[PDB]
Amino acid sequence: DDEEETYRLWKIRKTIMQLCHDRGYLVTQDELDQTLEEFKAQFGDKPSEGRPRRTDLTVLVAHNDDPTDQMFVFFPEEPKVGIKTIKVYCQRMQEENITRALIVVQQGMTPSAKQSLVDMAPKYILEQFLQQELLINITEHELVPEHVVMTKEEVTELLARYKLRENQLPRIQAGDPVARYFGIKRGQVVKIIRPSETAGRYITYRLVQ
Amino acid sequence: FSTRDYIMEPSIFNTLKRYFQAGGSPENVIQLLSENYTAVAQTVNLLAEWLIQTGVEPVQVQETVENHLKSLLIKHFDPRKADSIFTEEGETPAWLEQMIAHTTWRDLFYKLAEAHPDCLMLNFTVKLISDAGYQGEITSVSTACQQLEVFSRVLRTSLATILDGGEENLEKNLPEFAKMVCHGEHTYLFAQAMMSVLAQEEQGGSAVRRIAQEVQRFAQEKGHDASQITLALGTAASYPRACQALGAMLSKGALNPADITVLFKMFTSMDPPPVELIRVPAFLDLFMQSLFKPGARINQDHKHKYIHILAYAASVVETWKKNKRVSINKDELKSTSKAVETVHNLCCNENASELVAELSTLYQCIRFPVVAMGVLKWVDWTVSEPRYFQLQTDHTPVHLALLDEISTCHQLLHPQVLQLLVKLFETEHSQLDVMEQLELKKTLLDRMVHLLSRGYVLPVVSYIRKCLEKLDTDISLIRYFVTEVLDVIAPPYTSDFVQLFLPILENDSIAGTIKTEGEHDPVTEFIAHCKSNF
Amino acid sequence: KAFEKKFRFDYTNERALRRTLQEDLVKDVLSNAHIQNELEREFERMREDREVLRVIFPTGDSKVVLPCNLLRMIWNAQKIFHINPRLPSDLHPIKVVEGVKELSKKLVIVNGDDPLSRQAQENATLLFNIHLRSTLCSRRMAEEFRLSGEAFDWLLGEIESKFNQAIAHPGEMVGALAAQSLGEPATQMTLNTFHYAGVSAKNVTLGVPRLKELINISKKPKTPSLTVFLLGQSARDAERA
Amino acid sequence: QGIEQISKVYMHLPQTDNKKKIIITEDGEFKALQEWILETDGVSLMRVLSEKDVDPVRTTSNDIVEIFTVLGIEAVRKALERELYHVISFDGSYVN
Amino acid sequence: SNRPVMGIVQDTLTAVRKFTKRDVFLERGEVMNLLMFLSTWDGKVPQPAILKPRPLWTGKQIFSLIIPGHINCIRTHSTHPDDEDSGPYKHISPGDTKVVVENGELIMGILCKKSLGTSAGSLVHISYLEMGHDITRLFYSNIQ
Amino acid sequence: GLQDLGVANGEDLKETLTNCTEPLKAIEQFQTENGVLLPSLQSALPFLDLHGTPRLEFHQSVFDELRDKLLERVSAIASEGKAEERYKKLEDLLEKSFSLVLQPVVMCVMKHLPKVPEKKLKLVMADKELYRACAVEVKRQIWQDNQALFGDEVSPLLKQYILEKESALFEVVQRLTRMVGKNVKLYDMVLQFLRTLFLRTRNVHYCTLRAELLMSLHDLDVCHKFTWCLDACIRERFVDSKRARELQGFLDGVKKGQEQVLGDLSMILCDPFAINTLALSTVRHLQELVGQETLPLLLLLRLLALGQGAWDMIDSQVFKEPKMEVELITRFLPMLMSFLVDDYTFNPESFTKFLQEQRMACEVGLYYVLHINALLRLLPGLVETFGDLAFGDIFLHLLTGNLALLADEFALEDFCSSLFDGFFLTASPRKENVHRHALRLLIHLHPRVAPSKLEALQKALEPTGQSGEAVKELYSQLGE
């Protein structure tokens, strides 16, 4: 349905602003929360065979500080993205000075593309997602406790105070949905604040492995 | 000879007295005279009005706020220690001015604060209320009606309002109309004394007697034991034995075969007491409690006596020519006795195939109003029992069809039928499946639709409106009720009905109501009629 | 409004102050506004704690497990000192407030002056401190309990000692204890605990089988069920449901 | 119509107090608002949430692996706590 | 489950209930025999609740000797109708269905499992909490 | 006091009531009255409050004025500065100023006083603005203090900068307060004042101006934005390379203009934190080039940009400075010699002297980085070059390096540093003498220099005629 598609795209964009803002990229409140009718007026309400369609609403956002690093998203028209298309996206970024970008695929994306992204990760980091997984925020869920990335300066004296090495810390897998949402790389620390029925608030510390 | 003051000119009256004869060391007098060190605060307050002129609200709201602040300050610094002396010494310039200008709530608040002190102030307030064209519209307090004039005037106004309103007013102002009369039993007896005289006359005596009925009903649960007093007011006091027996009966609040035997003996005689003694609703209610209860079986030794007593109470007539009865009828009490006995045996047998089989004869018996509302009460007691719904074919169609028959055969029973049905609908019955409960509520709404069809329409629609507004039940029930209602209504449409039914119609997913009507538009026609009417 | 009326300890009403506290106490309280300011500060902190508790317990359940039973100790102390709360109290609210603050500093869970250690300390006893502050609020303290100052400080000492005892000792083999104390109730439980119902109810299949399939996380469980909530008027309406 | 690996679905109003939603009235009291809820026999999460009118906050499953695949590890730890507590205290036996 | 487990065996439970019935009356010789076995006993007989016409003690008096130290507790009997507390007489139970102990003395209430056994917050639990486990041991022994 | 219509009427009534009869009742009636106040309430007040003070009415009026200010804010938010609401607020403020000499008037002006035609007249009337100058952020804050308050703040800013420099030898709130009255004209005036202060200080004010601009951009910011972002990236990453590349690209993609590029370069260069960051980046680039063995190349571009920024302050309307590619090889030659010496140890002097004689911020930074057989030979050459340079910033960097060496705790290096610090204290001002005394406080860990160090400090206390030398000598004597 055309209305179903436009609604889905509106939700996708909404989740994307929420993701970026949580990640730490400056975004204006208007985009952070805008009405479905507002987006429909913006884009035509006819994604199917209409002036709105994929790659039209791709947005570029810079970090809150140090505007050198900026990130934008790719919206392949085809369901299963092509390796040639990802290479074209890479070249588009090459024209840009920013090495960070995201991709949203309607369908599963090729394992060859997976390997390609892994190979070109070091020079520039490109991350992919899927419609259904991004269709609803995960952080919103009550079951999910509060998550915060950590920094080197804080991790250092944290380890010093607790007289333990990073390995001893309880671990979390890198490819988990939460670590993917936060774009956390290996060897990075995340603190979790949770409501405990028996002590009110509990703090836990985790390492992305 | 001081000339030391910035805004103390207002207190110049006391300043002159403290200065002309200051003498000694007038340090305190000088301090009082120069106490208003601020600027002309009265002028500042006046200019506050000018500022509000250009402000958001250049209206009398500021004046009302200032008056409220002054009243609150007076209440806070009320001279309760010497309030009586202050009110009763002069009483000339303060009470008169307050009644003339600030009589809105100042006097009422002062009276209601304690009401013990300031006897002169209370008397002045009562006099002002009496002088006011609107009888004591300010002094509406349950503990402030301890004065003959104020209480009688307020009671007269309340009675006039109730009579002007009518049946629709029988429920809203009655509780607050009774809260003061029942506050003191001396006041209650005085009201009953005047009210019996009012009822003596033929015209309006029925209404006055009815008002007495609901008033004594309220007093009963309020805690009054004035059954003997009511009997004294009634003609039953003419017979000391009858009055004593009936007073004991009412005080016990049950039925005693030993005393009812005496009542039967003195009844069905050549000179029966004036039926007004047995026409009191309270004794009939005691009869209802004792007789038609699903349980509580009686020894039945005097079963015929109870049946005959009920038939005599609800059937016989008399012609009070100059307060003298010379023409009475007793040809219908026999049929009444037969029907009531049949219904009593139906209640006693406590069984369902035979109940359905005799249902046809019960329909004939319903034509007696007493039998109909006895069936109503027994059905209420049976249904209200928790877990009464365990086996159902059409959600207990028997009892609900009995209610429909009662409503059709007797229009005056509609308020009580609605009360029972709405109580049942409000009640949530657990131990049942959700779908079953939903269907049960739909069945209840079917009886709502029947009551509406029987002309008891405005209260039904009003209750539906109220239930939608507060404690929102599932929208499905409201939709279903509206769909059924639209079927039974055809033009013409009363304007008041259209107004009552309108707001629920144009909200809460209107389009969902129309699914496959096709032949006749359910809500489109009503909308067109409403547009034409308004 | 009820919390306000129950914990404000308003001082404007002179008669209530006379009934509760002595003449010297009421006169000093009315004279010193700073005491009133601190009382207002305590009330605001209690309001914030009330909001925090309405956050932490979404359920409307007030049943919680705490290392101390303040009401029982208050009861014991009252009859120990023969308070006879009919008479007005003889202690000022300032001692109550300072003593509760001092106790809040006395009880320790996380040691160290490190900011990370500091955050952890108050987080650990966050709930217990809220409970003790709510119970020992000056309003209830002076009104419903009416302890003397000696009873008050003795009670504070008792709380200190009891919370000292409640500390979990180091070196206790606690993982084994926890798992094994899970075992005994499992033994008590039986697969027949469920007597079924007229409605299928999704066949929860609670009991030892459920615990089994949970302990060894199973890819395919017997009755994988999903609970679903609707948003608004769609849920309100059965038809939309 | 519908999704796969999902058989007949039940609907009911939660009698139990914990399940039914609670609203903080302006006066401060919690009020328990009974409301329709659904139970599906064949669990397929992240596809129910994709649909319309589905609450993403209150939804929870009874399995473990499915929620693990979609909500990290803290989510499953908490949900496992919830379920195990439910089972062990169904009989009224309280465990610390 | 942070509860007491030693509880009270079935037989002594029924015996203590029938003993602490609200109307139990006992003779001088029987009381003088019973008090012997209380290990923690001070050695001074308590005043009877009834003196004239005859000296007649009460099992609650006897049990107050058993209860050690000075403890305060409230518990609801198993047969306690809840509406009683809602209505009047909430401090004088017609059925003595409110368990009330003050300063190591049983004031009014029939002891049952809900006030003695493994029920959480029970008299045994509070005794252990307040006094020494040795005190609680002597308490159990004397009860039995 | 204030004499509005009502004030003048009250004054006239008071003057006329001093004589000519004027009985009490007539005077009370003719003085003034409260239209809102009811006669019944007025009559009852004497019998209850015993001539109660009208201060309750004044408090109620103050509360009503606060509510009116809130209503004006609500109207400006819903009506978006509605013309009628603005006119009513202006009329009310004028009336309040005329009547009371004015807390409600000041509050109303602050809440809503934009584009007020009578705002200039009101400000002129409140020329003193003892409290109003700060209370009226709309006018006093918005260009009110530009004429004199801006200069006063600049003087306090200079004092704060001097105090910070003195403390380092041994702010944000003010900038936020200044920027609170943020408008187009306010920003232009602030920029002009900052440029004037930087010109007067000869570079000192440039760092403060750049920091203030960066803070304003970061918090409620709104080529300036690009410059602020580049500066923030450089500050966040001392050795960052992507940020440096982005900044270089932005600078290259800057069209030639009248004083714009000059101001950007001056702001970049005149920043002690910025200078330190540039020096650290250059040192890191040189180390990377040495490791890669690819000596000559973004390091050359970075060095050229740093030199242009440093030389921009010489004169206005400047484009850039010569790259000096040929001289780059000679400059890097000492680094290659030092690296070769270090490699030989783990397995010159003339150039250092020439560099020290030549004035080069890059040379000073390289010497500081180096301080932070072949190595021994290079060290004397570095010392000679630093002595030849003899700059104040070079002395500060040498003090930092001496602190680092003291942390390293080198015995022979300790004696060499003691001699160098003595020479630097003798040559430099009281600040240099105090720094040398502080270093010597922990210096002389060996007993063979401790008495000598004490004697040298005692001699320098007298030799340093400035009070700083005497203070340092007294502190050293007290310590030991």
Author numbering:
A (entry chain 4): 2 to 210
B (entry chain g): 51 to 401, 404 to 586
C (entry chain 1): 914 to 1154
D (entry chain 1): 1299 to 1394
E (entry chain 1): 530 to 673
F (entry chain f): 4 to 104, 109 to 177, 199 to 250, 259 to 332, 338 to 388, 408 to 432, 439 to 546
Original paper wording:
Integrator complex functions as an RNA endonuclease to cleave different classes of RNAs. More recent studies discovered that Integrator is enriched in the proximity of gene promoters and can associate with paused Pol II bound by DSIF and NELF to trigger PTT and repress gene activity.
Structural comparison shows that the phosphatase and endonuclease modules of INTAC are more separated in INTAC-PEC to fit the binding of PEC. A previously undetected tail module extends out of the bottom of the backbone module and folds back to bind Pol II. The PEC complex sits above the main body of INTAC through interface-I/-II/-V and is further stabilized by two INTAC protrusions on opposite sides at interface-III/-IV. Cryo-EM map reveals four putative Pol II CTD segments, indicative of a potential CTD-binding path toward the active center of PP2A-C for dephosphorylation. At the interface-V, the SPT5 KOWx-4 domain contacts the INTS11 metallo-β-lactamase domain, which bridges the RNA exit tunnel of Pol II and RNA entry tunnel of INTS11.
